[PDB]
Amino acid sequence: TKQPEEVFDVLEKLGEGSVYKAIHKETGQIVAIKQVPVESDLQEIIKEISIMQQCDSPHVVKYYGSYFKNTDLWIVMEYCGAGSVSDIIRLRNKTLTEDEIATILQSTLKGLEYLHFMRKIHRDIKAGNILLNTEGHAKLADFGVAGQLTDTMAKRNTVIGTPFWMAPEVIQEIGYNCVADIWSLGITAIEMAEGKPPYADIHPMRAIFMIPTNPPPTFRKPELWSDNFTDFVKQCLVKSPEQRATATQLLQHPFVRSAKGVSILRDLINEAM
Ligand SMILES: COCCNC(=O)Nc1cc(F)c(Oc2ccnc3[nH]cc(-c4cncs4)c23)c(F)c1
């Protein structure tokens, strides 16, 4: 009920909808505030907030609430100071090591296990939608295209996501379920190792045509990568969604199961900031 500027001291812009770092003045907690015009298209803003409000997981970006200020909507969220994994790759101009990827994807998979239990499908898993806080904890972000299964709707059939990362069953007319995110996770693993997903240099509308017919992608330089990492990607990129591994099962994959603690990401985060 209080004016947003009395609750929050807005600091630096982080992004440009438009995102600001801010201090919650009563607790000293740092938050991220997304500001959008109330007259803008709010379709995915409304979707993403509805999904985040239903989530309570250390592996999913928290939503704290919304204010009107003048003719803007302020969306208050958990602050992830290291930014996205794709930001960290770009800023350091370096791909991630196997150990760094195992640690990030362990936390990503715990977030997917939580969403999938709640019958949610992220549908836009990619390095750009995995954020790190300054302590190195990975959180799922951008729920703007997330789907919800129900008692009466056991499958979604909307062709939606970001083409290079989309599962074959999502692209094809057939309905699909939570394990579409596991395919996207496999593409994300390659993206973190190589800096870009398979087919990154071809037209996205051409790539979407080939993903359903092509064999599962593999590493560009297979000799660089352990048997465990190679097998982890192969298991994620099983074309049959019925056969594809779940988040729970991949948390036991040898690539993920022995991931190092978030300390392995300290150098990484320091360099990026
Ligand atoms: C030059 O290339 C583009 C530059 N990259 C970039 O601007 N990255 C970026 C990443 C983010 F994660 C950003 O957003 C955040 C930031 C921190 N902590 C958050 N907590 C929550 C967010 C979210 C906001 N939008 C949806 S979640 C958030 C952002 F604004 C910008």
Domain boundary among 34, 63, 78: 78
Residue 86 Cβ < 6 Å to ligand 1:
no
* Residue 137: both structure tokens together: 């904890």
The residue from 78, 102, 131 where one domain ends is 78
Nearest to 48 by CA among 186, 163, 178, 140: 140
Q: How far is the CA of 35 from the centre of ligand 1 (A)?
A: 12
The atom of ligand 1 lying closest to the CA of 78 is 20
Residues 199 and 91 in one domain: yes
Backbone angles phi, psi at 28, to 5 degrees: 70, 5
In 3D space, the residue among 160, 153, 152, 147 whose CA is nearest the CA of residue 116 turns out to be 147
Do residues 47 and 102 share a domain? Answer: no
**What's the domain range around 72?**
4-78
Residues 73 and 166 placed together within one structural domain of the fold: no
Number of H-type helices and E-type strands within the chain: 11, 10
Give the separation between CA 259 and CA 104, rounded to whole angstroms: 9
**In angstroms, rounded to a whole number, what is the distance separating the alpha carbons of residues 171 and 86?**
24
Letter for the amino acid at 31? V
Looking at the structure, do residues 170 and 268 belong to the same domain, yes or no?
yes
Residues of each annotated binding site for ATP: 14-19, 34
Catalytic residues: 124
Report how far residue 148's alpha carbon sits from residue 248's, in angstroms, rounded to the nearest whole number: 19
Resolution for the entry shown, Å: 1.9
Number of domains in the chain: 2
Ligand 1 pocket member 83 (CB < 6 A): yes
Read off the CATH number of the domain in which 67 is found.
3.30.200.20
Question: Taking each helix axis from N to C terminus, what angle separates 180-194 and 85-92, rounded to the nearest 10 degrees?
Answer: 10
Let me know whether 34 and 124 are in one domain. no
Q: How far apart are CA 179 and CA 185, in angstroms?
A: 10
Could you give the C-alpha distances from 88 to 104, 122, 175, 192, in angstroms and in order? 12, 22, 35, 10
**Residue 243 class from Cβ within 10 Å (0-12 exposed, 13-18 middle, 19+ buried)?**
exposed
- Please tell me what DSSP assigns to residue 25: T
SS3 (DSSP) at 106:
helix
Distance 17 CA to ligand 1 centre (A): 9
- 81 C-alpha to ligand 1 centroid (Å): 9
Q: Residues 56, 111: one domain?
A: no
Q: How was this structure obtained?
A: X-ray
Asked whether the beta carbons of 236 and 185 are under 8 A apart, the reply is: yes
**Ligand 1 pocket, mutate which of 12, 13, 14, 87 (most atoms under 8 A from CB):** 14
The domain that contains 144 carries what CATH number? 1.10.510.10
Q: Please tell me whether residues 165 and 184 are part of one structural domain.
A: yes
* Domain endpoint, select from 78, 100, 124: 78
Q: Tell the residue nearest (CA) to atom 2 of ligand 1.
A: 87
Tokens 């009920």, located at residue? 1
d(CA 266, CA 272): 10
CA of 54 relative to ligand 1 center, distance in Å: 21
Same domain, 141 and 186: yes
Which residues, in sequence order, are CB contacts of 107 under 8 Å at separation 6+? 59, 137, 138, 139, 262
Q: Residue 177: which of 110, 242, 97 has the closest Cα?
A: 242
How far is Cα 223 from Cα 136, in angstroms, rounded to an integer? 29
